[PDB]
């Protein structure tokens, strides 16, 4: 439960991906199978980079769950 009490209606797995957390704290909202859920990673963990052209492509599984591992390694300094 990432949205908490103010999450909305219903509350079940079914064929839809729901709020999922991450090591760095990346809260992934509701979704579904075969859905490319992309988002710019929080590289600004101090104050580095002044462009930021990388992304985090975390697609959901086809059965109805999140993928094994997300490609967050694409994040790098401003060089």
């Amino acid at each position: 439960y990432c949205h908490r009490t103010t999450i909305g209606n219903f509350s079940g797995p079914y064929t839809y991906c729901n709020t999922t957390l991450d090591q760095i704290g990346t809260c992934w909202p509701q979704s579904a199978p075969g859905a490319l859920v992309e988002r710019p990673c929080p590289e600004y963990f101090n104050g580095i980079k002044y462009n930021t052209t990388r992304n985090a492509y975390r697609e959901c599984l086809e059965n109805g769950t999140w993928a094994s591992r997300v490609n967050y390694s694409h994040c790098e300094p401003i060089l």
Binding site: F45, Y72, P77
Partner: peptide, 15 residues
């Protein structure tokens, strides 16, 4: 920055 971005991203591979 020079030595932070690394640890920052180093924590990204864990994701």
């Amino acid at each position: 920055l020079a030595q932070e971005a690394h640890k920052n991203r180093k924590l990204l591979e864990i994701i």
